[PDB]
PDB file of C-alpha atoms and ligand atoms in Angstrom:
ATOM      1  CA  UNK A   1     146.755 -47.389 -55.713  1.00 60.58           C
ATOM      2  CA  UNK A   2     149.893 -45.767 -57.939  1.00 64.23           C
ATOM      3  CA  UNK A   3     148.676 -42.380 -58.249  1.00 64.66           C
ATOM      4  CA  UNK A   4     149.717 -41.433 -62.117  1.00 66.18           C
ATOM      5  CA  UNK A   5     150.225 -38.140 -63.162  1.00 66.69           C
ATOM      6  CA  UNK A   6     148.518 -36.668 -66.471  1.00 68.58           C
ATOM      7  CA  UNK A   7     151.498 -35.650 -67.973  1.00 67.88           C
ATOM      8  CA  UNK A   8     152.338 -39.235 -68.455  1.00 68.28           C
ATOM      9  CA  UNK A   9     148.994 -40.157 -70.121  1.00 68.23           C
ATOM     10  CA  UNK A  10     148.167 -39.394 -73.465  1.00 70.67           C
ATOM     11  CA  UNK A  11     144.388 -39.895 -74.758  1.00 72.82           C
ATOM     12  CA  UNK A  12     144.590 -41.174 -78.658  1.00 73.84           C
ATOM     13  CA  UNK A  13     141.156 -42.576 -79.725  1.00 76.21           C
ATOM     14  CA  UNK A  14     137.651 -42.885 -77.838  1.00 76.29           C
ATOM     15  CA  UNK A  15     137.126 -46.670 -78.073  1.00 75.57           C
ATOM     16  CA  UNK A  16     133.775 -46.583 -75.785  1.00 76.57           C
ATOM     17  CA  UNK A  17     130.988 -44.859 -73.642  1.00 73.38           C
ATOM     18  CA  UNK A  18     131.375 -47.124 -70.797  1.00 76.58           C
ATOM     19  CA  UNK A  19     129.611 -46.888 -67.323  1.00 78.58           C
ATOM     20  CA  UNK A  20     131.651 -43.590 -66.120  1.00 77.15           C
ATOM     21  CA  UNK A  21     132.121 -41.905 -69.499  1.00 72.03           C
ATOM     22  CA  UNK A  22     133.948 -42.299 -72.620  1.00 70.09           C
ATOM     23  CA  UNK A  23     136.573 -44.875 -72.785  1.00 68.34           C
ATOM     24  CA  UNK A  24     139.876 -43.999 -74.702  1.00 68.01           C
ATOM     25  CA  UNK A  25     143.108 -45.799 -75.682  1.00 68.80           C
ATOM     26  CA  UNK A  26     146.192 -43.837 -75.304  1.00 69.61           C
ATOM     27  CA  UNK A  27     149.651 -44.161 -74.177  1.00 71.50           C
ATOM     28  CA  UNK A  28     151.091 -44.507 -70.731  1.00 71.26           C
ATOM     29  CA  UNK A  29     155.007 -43.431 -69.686  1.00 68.63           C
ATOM     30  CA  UNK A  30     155.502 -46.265 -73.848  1.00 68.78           C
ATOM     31  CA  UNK A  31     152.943 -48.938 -73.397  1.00 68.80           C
ATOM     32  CA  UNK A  32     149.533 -49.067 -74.954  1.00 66.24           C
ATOM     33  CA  UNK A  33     146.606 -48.423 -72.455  1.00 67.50           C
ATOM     34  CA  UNK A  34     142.820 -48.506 -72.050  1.00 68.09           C
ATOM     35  CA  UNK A  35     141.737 -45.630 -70.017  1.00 64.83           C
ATOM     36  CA  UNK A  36     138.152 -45.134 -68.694  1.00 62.74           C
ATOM     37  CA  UNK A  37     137.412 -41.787 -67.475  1.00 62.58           C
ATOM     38  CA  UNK A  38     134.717 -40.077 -65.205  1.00 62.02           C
ATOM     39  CA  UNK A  39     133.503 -37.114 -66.072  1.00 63.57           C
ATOM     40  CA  UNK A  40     132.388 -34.159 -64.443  1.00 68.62           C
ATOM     41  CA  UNK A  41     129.452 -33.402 -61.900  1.00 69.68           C
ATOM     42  CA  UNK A  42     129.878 -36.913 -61.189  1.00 68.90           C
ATOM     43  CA  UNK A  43     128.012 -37.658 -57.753  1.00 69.15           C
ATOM     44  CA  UNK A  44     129.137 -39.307 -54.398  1.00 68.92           C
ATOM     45  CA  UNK A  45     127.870 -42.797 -55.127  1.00 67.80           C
ATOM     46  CA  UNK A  46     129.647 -42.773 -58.801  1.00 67.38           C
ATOM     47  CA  UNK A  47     132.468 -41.686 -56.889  1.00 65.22           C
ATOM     48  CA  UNK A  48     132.523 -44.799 -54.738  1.00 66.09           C
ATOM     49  CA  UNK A  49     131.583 -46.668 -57.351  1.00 65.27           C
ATOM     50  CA  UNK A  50     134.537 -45.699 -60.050  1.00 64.40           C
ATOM     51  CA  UNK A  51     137.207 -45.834 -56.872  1.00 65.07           C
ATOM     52  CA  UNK A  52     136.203 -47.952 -55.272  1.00 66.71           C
ATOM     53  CA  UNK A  53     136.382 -50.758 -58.531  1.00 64.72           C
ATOM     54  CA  UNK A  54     140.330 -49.082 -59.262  1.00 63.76           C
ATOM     55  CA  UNK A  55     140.873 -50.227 -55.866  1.00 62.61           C
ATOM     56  CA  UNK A  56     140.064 -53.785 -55.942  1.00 64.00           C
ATOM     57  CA  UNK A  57     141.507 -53.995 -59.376  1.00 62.41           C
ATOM     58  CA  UNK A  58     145.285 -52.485 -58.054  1.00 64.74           C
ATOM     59  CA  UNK A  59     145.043 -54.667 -55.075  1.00 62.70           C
ATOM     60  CA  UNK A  60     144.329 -57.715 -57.111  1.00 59.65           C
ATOM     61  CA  UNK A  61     147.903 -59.547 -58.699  1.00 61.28           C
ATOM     62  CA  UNK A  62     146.400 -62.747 -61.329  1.00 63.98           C
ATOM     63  CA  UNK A  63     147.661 -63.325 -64.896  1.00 65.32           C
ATOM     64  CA  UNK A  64     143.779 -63.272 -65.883  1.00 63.46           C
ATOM     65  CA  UNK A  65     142.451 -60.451 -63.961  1.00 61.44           C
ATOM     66  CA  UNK A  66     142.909 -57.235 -66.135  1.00 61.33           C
ATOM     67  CA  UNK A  67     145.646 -55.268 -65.058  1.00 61.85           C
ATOM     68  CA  UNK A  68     145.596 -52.080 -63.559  1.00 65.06           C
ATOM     69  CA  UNK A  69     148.524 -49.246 -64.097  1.00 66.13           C
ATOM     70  CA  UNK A  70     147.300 -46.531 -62.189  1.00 62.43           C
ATOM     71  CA  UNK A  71     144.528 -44.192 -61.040  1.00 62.93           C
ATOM     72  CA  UNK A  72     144.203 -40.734 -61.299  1.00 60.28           C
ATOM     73  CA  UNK A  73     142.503 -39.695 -58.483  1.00 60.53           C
ATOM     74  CA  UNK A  74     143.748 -35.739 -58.077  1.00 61.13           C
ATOM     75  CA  UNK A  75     143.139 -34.250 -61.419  1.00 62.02           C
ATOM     76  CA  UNK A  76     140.080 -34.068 -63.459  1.00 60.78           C
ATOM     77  CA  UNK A  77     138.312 -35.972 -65.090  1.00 59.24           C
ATOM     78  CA  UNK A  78     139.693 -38.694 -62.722  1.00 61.08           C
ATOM     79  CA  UNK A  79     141.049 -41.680 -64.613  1.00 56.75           C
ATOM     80  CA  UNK A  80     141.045 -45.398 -64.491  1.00 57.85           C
ATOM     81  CA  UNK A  81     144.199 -46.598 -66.747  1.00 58.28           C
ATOM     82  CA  UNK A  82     144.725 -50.336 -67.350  1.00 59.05           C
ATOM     83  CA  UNK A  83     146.788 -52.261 -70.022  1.00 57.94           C
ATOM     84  CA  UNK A  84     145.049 -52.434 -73.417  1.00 59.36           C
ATOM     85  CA  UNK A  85     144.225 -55.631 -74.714  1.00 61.74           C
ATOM     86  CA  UNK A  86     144.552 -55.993 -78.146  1.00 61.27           C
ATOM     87  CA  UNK A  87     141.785 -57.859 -79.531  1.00 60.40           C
ATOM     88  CA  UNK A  88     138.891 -56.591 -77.714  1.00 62.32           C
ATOM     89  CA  UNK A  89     136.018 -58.132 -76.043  1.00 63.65           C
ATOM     90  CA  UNK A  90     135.957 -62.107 -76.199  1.00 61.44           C
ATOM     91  CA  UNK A  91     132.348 -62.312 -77.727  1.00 57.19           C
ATOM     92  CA  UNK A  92     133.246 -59.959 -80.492  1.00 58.63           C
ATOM     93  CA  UNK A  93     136.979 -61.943 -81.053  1.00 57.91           C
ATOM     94  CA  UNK A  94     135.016 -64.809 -81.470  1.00 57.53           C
ATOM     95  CA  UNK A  95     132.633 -64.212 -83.744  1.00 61.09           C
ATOM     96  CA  UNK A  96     135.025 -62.554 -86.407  1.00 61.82           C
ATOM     97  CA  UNK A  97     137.314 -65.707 -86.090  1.00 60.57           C
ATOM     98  CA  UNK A  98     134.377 -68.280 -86.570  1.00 60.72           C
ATOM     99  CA  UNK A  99     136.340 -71.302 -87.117  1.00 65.33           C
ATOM    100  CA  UNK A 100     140.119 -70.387 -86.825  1.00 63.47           C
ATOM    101  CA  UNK A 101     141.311 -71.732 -83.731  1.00 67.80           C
ATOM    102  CA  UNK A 102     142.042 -75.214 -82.350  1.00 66.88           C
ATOM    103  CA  UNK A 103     139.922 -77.294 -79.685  1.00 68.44           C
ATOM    104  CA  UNK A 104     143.177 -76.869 -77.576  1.00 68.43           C
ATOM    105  CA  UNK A 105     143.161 -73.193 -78.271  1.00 66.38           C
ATOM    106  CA  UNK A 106     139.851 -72.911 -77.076  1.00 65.11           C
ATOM    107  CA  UNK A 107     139.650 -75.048 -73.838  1.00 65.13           C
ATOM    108  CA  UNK A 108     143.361 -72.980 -72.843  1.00 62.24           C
ATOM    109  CA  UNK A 109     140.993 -69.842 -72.972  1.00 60.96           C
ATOM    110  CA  UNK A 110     138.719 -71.667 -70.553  1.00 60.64           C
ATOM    111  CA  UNK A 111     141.026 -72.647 -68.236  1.00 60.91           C
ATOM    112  CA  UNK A 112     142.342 -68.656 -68.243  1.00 60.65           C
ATOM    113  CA  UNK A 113     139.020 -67.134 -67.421  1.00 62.93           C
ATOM    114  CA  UNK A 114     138.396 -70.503 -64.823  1.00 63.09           C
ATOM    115  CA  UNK A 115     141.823 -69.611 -63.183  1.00 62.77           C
ATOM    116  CA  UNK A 116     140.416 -65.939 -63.099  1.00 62.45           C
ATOM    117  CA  UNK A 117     137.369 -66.517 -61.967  1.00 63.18           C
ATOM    118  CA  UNK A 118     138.482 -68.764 -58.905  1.00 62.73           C
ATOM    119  CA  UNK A 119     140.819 -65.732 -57.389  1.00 60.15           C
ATOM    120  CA  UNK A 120     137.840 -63.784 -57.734  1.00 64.31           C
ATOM    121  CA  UNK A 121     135.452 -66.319 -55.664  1.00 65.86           C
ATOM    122  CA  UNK A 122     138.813 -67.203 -53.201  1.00 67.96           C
ATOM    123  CA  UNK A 123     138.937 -63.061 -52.639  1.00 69.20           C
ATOM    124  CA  UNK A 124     135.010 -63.148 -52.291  1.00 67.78           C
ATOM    125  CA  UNK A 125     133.614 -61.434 -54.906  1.00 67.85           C
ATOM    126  CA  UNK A 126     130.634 -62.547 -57.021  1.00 66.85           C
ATOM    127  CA  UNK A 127     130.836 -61.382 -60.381  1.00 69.12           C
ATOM    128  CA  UNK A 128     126.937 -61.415 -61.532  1.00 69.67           C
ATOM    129  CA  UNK A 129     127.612 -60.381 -64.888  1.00 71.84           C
ATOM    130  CA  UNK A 130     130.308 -63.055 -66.286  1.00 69.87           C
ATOM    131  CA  UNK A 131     129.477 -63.206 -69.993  1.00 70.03           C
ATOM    132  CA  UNK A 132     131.786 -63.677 -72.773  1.00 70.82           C
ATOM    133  CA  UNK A 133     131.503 -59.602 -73.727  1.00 71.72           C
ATOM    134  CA  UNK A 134     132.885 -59.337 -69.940  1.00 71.18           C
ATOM    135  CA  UNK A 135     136.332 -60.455 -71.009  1.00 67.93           C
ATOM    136  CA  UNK A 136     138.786 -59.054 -72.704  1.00 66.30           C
ATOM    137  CA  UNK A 137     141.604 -60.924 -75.044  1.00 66.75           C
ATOM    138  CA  UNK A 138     145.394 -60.093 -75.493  1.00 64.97           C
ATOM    139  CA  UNK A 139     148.261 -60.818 -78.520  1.00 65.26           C
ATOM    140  CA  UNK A 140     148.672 -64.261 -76.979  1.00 71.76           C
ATOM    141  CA  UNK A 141     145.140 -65.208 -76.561  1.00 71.42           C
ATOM    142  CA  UNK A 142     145.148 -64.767 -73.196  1.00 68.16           C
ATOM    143  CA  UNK A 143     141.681 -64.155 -71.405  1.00 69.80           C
ATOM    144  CA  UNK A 144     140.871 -61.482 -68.330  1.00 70.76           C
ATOM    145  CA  UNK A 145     137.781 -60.983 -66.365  1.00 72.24           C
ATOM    146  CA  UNK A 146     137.043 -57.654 -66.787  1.00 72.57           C
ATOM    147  CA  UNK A 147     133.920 -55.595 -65.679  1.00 70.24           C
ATOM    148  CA  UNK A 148     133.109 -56.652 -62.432  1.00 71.63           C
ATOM    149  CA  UNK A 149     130.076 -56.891 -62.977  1.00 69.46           C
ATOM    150  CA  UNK A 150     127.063 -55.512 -60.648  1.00 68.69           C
ATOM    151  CA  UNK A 151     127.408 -54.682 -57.635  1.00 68.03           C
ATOM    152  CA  UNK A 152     121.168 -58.594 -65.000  1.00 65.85           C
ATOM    153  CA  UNK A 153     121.492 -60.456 -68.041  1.00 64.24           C
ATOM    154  CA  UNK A 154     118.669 -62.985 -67.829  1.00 62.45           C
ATOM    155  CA  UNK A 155     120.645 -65.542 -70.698  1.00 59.49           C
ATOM    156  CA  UNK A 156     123.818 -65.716 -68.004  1.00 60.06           C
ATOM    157  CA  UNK A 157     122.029 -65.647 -65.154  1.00 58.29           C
ATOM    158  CA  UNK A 158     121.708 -68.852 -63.187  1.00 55.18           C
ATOM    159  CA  UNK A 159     118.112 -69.888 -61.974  1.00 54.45           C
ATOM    160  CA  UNK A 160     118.424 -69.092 -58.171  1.00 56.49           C
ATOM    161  CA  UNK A 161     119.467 -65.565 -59.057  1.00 55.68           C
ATOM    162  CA  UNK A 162     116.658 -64.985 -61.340  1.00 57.40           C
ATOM    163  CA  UNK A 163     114.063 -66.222 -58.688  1.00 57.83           C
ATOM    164  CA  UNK A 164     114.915 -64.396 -55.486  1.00 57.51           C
ATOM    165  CA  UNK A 165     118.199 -62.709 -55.778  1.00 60.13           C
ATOM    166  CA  UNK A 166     120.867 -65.479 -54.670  1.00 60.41           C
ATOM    167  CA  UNK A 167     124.383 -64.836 -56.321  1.00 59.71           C
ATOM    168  CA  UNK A 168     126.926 -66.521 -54.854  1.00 60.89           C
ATOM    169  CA  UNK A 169     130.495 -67.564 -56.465  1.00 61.80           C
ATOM    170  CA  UNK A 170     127.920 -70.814 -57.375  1.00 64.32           C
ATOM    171  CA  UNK A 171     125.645 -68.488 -59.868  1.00 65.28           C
ATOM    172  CA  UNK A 172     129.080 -67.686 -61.054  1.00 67.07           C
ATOM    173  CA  UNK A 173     129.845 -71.000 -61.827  1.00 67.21           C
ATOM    174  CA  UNK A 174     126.267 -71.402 -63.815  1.00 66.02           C
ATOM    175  CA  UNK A 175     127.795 -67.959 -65.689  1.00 63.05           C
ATOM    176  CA  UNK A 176     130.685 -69.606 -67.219  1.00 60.45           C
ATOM    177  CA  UNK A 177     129.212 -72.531 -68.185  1.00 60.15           C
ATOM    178  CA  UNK A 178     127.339 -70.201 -70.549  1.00 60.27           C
ATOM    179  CA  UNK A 179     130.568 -68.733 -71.493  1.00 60.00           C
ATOM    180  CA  UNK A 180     132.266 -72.560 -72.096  1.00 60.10           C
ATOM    181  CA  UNK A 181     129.099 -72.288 -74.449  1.00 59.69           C
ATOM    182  CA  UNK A 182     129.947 -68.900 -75.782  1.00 62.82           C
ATOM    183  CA  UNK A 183     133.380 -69.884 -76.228  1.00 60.06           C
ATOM    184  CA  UNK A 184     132.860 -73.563 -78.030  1.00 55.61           C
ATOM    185  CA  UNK A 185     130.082 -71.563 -80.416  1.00 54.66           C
ATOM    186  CA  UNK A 186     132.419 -68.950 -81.465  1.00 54.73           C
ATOM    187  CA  UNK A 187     129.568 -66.188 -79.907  1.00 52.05           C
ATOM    188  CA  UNK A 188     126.535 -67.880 -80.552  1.00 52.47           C
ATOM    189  CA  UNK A 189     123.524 -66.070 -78.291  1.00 57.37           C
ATOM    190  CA  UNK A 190     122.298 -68.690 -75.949  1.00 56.32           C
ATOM    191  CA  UNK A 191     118.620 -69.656 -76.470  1.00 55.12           C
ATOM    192  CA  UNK A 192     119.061 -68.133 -79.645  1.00 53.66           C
ATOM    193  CA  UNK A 193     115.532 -68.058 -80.127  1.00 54.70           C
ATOM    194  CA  UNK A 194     113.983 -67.834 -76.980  1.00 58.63           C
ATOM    195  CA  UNK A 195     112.186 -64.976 -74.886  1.00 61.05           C
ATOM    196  CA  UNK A 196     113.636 -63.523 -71.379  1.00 61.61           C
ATOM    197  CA  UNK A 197     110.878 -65.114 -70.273  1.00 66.56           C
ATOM    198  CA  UNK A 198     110.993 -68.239 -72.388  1.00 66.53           C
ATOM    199  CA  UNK A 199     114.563 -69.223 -71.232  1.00 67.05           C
ATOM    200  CA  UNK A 200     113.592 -68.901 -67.254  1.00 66.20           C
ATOM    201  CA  UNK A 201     110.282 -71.292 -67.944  1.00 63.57           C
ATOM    202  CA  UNK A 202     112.792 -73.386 -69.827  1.00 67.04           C
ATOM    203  CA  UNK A 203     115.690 -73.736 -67.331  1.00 66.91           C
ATOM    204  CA  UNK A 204     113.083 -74.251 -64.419  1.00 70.83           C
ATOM    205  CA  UNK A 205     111.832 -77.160 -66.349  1.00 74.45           C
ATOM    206  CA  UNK A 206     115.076 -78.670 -67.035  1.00 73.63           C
ATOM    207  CA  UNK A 207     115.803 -77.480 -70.953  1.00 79.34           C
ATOM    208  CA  UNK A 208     119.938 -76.866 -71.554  1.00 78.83           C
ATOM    209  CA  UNK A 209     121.683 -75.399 -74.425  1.00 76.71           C
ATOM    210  CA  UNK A 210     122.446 -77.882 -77.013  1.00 76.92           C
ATOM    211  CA  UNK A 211     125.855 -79.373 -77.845  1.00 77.83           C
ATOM    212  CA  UNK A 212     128.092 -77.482 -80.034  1.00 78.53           C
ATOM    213  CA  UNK A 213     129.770 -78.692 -83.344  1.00 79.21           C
ATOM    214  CA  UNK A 214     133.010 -79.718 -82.817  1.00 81.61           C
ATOM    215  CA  UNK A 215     133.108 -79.418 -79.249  1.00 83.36           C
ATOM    216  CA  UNK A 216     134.508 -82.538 -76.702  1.00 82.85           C
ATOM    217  CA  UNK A 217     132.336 -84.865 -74.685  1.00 84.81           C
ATOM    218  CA  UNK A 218     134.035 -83.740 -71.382  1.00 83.38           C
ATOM    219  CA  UNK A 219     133.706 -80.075 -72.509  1.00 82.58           C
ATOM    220  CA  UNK A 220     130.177 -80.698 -73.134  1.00 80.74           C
ATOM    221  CA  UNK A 221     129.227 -82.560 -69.726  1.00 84.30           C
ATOM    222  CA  UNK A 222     131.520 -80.242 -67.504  1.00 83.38           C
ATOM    223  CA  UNK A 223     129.585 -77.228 -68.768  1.00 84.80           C
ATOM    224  CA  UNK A 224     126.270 -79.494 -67.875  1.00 82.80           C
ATOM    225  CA  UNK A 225     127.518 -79.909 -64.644  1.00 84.16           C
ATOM    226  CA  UNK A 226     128.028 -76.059 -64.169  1.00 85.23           C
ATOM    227  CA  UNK A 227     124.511 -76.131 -65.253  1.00 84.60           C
ATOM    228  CA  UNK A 228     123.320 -78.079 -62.321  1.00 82.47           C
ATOM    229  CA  UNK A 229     119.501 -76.639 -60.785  1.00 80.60           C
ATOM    230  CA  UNK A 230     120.807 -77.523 -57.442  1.00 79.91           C
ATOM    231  CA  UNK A 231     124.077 -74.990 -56.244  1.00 80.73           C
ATOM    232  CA  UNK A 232     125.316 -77.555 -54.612  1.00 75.67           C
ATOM    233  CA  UNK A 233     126.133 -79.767 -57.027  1.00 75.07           C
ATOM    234  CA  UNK A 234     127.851 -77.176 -59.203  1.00 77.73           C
ATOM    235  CA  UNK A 235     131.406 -77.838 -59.531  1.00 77.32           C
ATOM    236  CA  UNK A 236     133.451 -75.151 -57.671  1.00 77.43           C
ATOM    237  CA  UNK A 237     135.770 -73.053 -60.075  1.00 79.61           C
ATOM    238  CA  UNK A 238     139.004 -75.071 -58.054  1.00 77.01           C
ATOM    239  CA  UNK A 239     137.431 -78.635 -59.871  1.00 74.79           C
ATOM    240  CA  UNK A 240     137.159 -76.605 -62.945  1.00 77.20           C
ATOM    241  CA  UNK A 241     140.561 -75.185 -63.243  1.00 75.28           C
ATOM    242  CA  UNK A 242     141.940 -78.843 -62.621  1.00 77.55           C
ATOM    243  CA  UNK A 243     139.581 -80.848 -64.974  1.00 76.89           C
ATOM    244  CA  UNK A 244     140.272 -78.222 -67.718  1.00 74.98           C
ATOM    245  CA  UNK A 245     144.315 -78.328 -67.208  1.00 78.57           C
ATOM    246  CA  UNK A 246     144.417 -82.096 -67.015  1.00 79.03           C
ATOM    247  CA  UNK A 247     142.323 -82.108 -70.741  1.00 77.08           C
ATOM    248  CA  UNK A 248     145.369 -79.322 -71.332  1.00 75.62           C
ATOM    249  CA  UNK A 249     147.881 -81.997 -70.353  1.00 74.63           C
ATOM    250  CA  UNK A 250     146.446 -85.049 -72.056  1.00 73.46           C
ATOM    251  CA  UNK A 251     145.436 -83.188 -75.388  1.00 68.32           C
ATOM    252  CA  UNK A 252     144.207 -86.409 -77.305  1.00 70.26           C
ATOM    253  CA  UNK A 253     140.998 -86.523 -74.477  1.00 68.78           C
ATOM    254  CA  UNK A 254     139.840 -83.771 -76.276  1.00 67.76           C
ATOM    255  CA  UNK A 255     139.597 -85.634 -79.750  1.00 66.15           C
ATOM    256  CA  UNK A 256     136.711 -87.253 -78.339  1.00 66.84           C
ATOM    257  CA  UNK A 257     133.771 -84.996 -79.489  1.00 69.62           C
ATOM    258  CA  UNK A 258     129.968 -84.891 -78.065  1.00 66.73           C
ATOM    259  CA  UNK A 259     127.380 -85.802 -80.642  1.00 68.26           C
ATOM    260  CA  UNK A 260     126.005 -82.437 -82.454  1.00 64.40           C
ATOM    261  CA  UNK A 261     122.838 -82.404 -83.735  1.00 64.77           C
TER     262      UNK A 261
HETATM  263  O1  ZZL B 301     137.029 -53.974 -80.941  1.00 61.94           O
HETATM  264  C1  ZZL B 301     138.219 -53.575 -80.911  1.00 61.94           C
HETATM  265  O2  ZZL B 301     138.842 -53.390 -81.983  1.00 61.94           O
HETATM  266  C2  ZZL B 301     138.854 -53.395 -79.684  1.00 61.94           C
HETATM  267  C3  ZZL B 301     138.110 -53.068 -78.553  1.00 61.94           C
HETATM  268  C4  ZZL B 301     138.750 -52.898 -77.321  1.00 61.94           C
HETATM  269  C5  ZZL B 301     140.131 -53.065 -77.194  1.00 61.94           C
HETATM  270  N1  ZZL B 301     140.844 -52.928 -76.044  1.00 61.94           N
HETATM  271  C6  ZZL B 301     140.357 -52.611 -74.822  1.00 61.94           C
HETATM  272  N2  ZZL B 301     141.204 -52.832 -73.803  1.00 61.94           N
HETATM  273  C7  ZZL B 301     140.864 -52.552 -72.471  1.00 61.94           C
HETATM  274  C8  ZZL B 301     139.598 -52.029 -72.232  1.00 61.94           C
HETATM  275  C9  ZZL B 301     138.745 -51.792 -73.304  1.00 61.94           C
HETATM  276  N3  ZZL B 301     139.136 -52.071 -74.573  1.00 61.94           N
HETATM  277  C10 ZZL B 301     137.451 -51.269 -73.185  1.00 61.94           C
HETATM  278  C11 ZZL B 301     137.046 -50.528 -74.294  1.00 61.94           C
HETATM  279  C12 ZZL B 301     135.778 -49.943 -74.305  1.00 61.94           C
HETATM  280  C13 ZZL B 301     134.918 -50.106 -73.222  1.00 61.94           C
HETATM  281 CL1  ZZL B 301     133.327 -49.359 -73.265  1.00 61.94          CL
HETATM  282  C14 ZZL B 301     135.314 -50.865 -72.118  1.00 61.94           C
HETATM  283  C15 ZZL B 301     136.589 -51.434 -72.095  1.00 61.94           C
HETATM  284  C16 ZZL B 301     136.851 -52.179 -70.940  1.00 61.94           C
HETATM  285  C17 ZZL B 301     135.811 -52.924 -70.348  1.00 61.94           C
HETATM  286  C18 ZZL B 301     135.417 -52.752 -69.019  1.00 61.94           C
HETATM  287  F1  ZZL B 301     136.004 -51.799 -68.196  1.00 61.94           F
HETATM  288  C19 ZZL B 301     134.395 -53.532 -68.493  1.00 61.94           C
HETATM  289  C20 ZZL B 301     133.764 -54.508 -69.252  1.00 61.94           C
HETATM  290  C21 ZZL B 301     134.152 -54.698 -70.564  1.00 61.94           C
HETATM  291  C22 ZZL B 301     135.175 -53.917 -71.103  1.00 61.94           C
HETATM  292  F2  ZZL B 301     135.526 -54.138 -72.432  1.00 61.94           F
HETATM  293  N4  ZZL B 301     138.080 -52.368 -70.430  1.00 61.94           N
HETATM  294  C23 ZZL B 301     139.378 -51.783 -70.879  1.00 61.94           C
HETATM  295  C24 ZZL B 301     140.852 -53.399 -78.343  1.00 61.94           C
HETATM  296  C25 ZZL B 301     140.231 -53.560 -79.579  1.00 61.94           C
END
């Protein structure tokens, strides 16, 4: 991981607690970054833990996977320091923009956080925690896993994970169909509504979130399909990436909308 040194950060604005410590933005040697910090006293495991996520993040190189710049590792408080993106956290974005952006724009965000998602499962990591507040958004709407989740948010969670512990890259898949949701709703809460404890009787019996205004029939029944009880019968995120870029490619497929009620 590129060590960086402190002189060439510069702390401007605390932005966020976060799980190590306050979160800033600030300047790196100049371009705009995010930089999470841990603070002192820390212990061995939140060591590992803070480290050890810097160095999957350096290693990983995808266009929606947030970007690391650097670490530092050899001063105090040791630093995490990745680009800033500009408009925040996707569930946020969304819900101040109710309404401003094109079925096109929205299924292109999609496919970015699909196409993100699959390196992740391809490099074999299960995310857990993919939720619409888990990504971040940039100055050309671009989308990036962030977070990494856990190494358990009950409305995300798919229903094999919930009853005895099973995530695989498959309750990942269940995950973004609630974010295709997220995403379609401008940041409406799934289950609105519903208990915890509601929403797991209700997915065991078969109950789905309902269709969204405005949003196409093949949006509607791939996110159905992510929503499948059985794992195997989930579409991988591979089938998702290409379904969403051939709607991309043949943008008049998407004029077809689901019934809303
Ligand atoms: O609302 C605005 O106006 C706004 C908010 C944020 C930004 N930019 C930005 N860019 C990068 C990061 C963050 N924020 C950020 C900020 C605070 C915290 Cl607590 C976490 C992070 C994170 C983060 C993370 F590590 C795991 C999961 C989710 C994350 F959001 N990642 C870096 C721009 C505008």
């Amino acid at each position: 991981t590129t060590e960086i040194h402190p002189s060439c950060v510069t702390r401007q604005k605390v932005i966020g607690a976060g799980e190590f410590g306050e979160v800033y933005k600030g300047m790196l040697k100049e371009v705009p970054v995010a930089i999470k910090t841990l603070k002192a006293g820390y212990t061995e495991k939140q060591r590992v833990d803070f480290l050890g996520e810097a160095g999957i993040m350096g290693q990983f190189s995808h266009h929606n996977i947030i970007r690391l710049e650097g670490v530092i590792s050899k001063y105090k408080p040791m630093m995490i320091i990745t680009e800033y993106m500009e408009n925040g956290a996707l569930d946020k974005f969304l819900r101040e923009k109710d309404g401003e952006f094109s079925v096109l724009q929205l299924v292109g965000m999609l496919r970015g956080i699909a196409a993100g998602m699959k390196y992740l499962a391809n490099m074999n990591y299960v995310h857990r925690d993919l939720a619409a507040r888990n990504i971040l958004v940039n100055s050309n709407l671009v989308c990036k896993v962030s977070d990494f989740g856990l190494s358990i948010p009950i409305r995300w969670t798919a229903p094999e994970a919930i009853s005895y512990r099973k995530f695989t890259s498959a309750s990942d898949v269940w995950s973004f169909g609630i974010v295709m949701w997220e995403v379609m709703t401008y940041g409406e809460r799934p289950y609105w509504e519903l208990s915890n404890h509601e929403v797991m009787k209700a997915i065991n019996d078969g109950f789905r979130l309902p269709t969204p205004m405005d949003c196409p029939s093949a949006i509607y029944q791939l996110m159905m399909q992510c929503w499948q009880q059985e794992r195997a019968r989930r579409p991988k995120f591979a089938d998702i990436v290409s379904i969403l870029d051939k709607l991309i490619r043949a943008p008049d497929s998407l004029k077809t909308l689901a019934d809303f009620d």
